[PDB]
């Protein structure tokens, strides 16, 4: 039952360091198991480091050499990556990945079969800020044909990301959560909308559950007609 779980999104200032963790279950880390790969927004995957066939030690890509450290803690089944002298271009999603039990002993080869969920690291000098959450109430403007649109506006936060669910995850059908816009103030904002039977509106409670972990913000907004 192989799972891989990373630490949460972080903002750091230029010149600082970040340290991402990676906890694995359903498979025992060897000390040599974990690779790290990152992805800058809208760009391709970039390997950072890991154990290769030949050299019997952890290897780092030449772009990170003087400023990365990758450790693996067998008693805790947890892996860590530390990147220092951070710059703008280090804003990225950072992934750990492993072969798990995809080791072939007739050639030594493994693919990266199990990936963490990713940790977004934002490199900026702007302060962390939690969102305001406002309801987008259903009305006859948002109502046609037995269905109605309602929503939540998640305003003025830094850094990315936020999560929104509806009715603590019971409502998923008809949900659309938009990508954030980065406003000229340097803060983000996004909306999540759901379309529901307009017959429900009297009777069924609709609540958006908004989390912004970098600021420890948790808000559940009830959206009424």
């Amino acid at each position: 039952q192989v799972q891989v779980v990373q630490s949460g999104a972080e903002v750091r200032k230029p010149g600082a360091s970040v340290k991402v963790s990676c906890k694995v279950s359903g498979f025992t880390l060897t000390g040599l198991s974990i690779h790290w790969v990152r992805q800058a927004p809208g760009k391709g995957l970039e390997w950072m480091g890991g154990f290769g066939p030949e050299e019997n030690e952890i290897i780092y890509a030449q772009k990170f050499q003087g400023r990365v450290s990758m450790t693996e803690d067998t008693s805790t089944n947890t892996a860590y990556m530390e990147l220092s002298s951070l710059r703008s271009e280090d804003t990225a999603v950072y992934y750990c990945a492993t072969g798990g039990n995809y080791y072939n002993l007739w050639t030594g080869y493994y693919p990266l079969a199990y990936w963490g969920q990713g940790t977004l690291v934002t490199v900026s000098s702007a302060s962390t800020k939690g969102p305001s959450v406002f309801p987008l109430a259903p009305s006859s403007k948002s109502t046609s044909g037995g269905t109605a649109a309602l929503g939540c506006l998640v305003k003025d936060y830094f850094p990315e990301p936020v999560t929104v669910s509806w009715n603590s995850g019971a409502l998923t059908s008809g949900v659309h959560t938009f990508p954030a816009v980065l406003q000229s103030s340097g803060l983000y904002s996004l909306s999540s909308v759901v379309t529901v039977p307009s017959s429900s509106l009297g009777t069924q409670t609709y609540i958006c559950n908004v989390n912004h972990k970098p600021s420890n913000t948790k808000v559940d907004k009830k959206v009424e007609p």
């Binding site: 480091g49 066939p53 693919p111 990936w115 954030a180 909306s191």
Partner: protein, 215 residues
Amino acid sequence: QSVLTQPPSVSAAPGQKVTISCSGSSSNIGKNYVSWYQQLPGAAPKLLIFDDTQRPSGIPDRFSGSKSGTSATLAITGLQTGDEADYYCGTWDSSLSTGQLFGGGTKLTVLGQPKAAPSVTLFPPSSEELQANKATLVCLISDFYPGAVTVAWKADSSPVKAGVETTTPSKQSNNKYAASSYLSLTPEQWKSHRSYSCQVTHEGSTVEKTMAHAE
């Protein structure tokens, strides 16, 4: 030669076969084993093929991989709208320092779809936002194809440029696109005018919806 490349962009229609190639050299694809990954929007990469040709458990027989010379090819048959994703090849490079390579990735676009005109739905500022001495008008743009609109706001027929932000369109779970635009105002600007309008232009056709505080 310590480099993998791929075409940035491939497209085909539901039910067709499409291929994506990964080109390298003697030190990588020439000596080492190729794997392929799928990546949906937001999501971590997922292993599709490993060891040149092998599928993991759970990956359908529509996906296959092969290798020849210093190139490798992913093939997808019976293309589905769900296969719209980014695809990456990977292999170890035996040269130099170097270690694991990925190709720059290929965006696979699935081209089944007919033109659809956007729906436009407006929300006025909420009462809670106004009590906090701000006002945001929200224009939701939905069920359009292709995925390219321009959005403008008007107050009473004159253009409003300041305080507009619009998302780049992204696919809804029914495969048409949606986008959103926000107009920030003062509460007193909102309470004054006869009206504000979101105008959405799509393939040379403009649709608008209009609202006002009095409503």
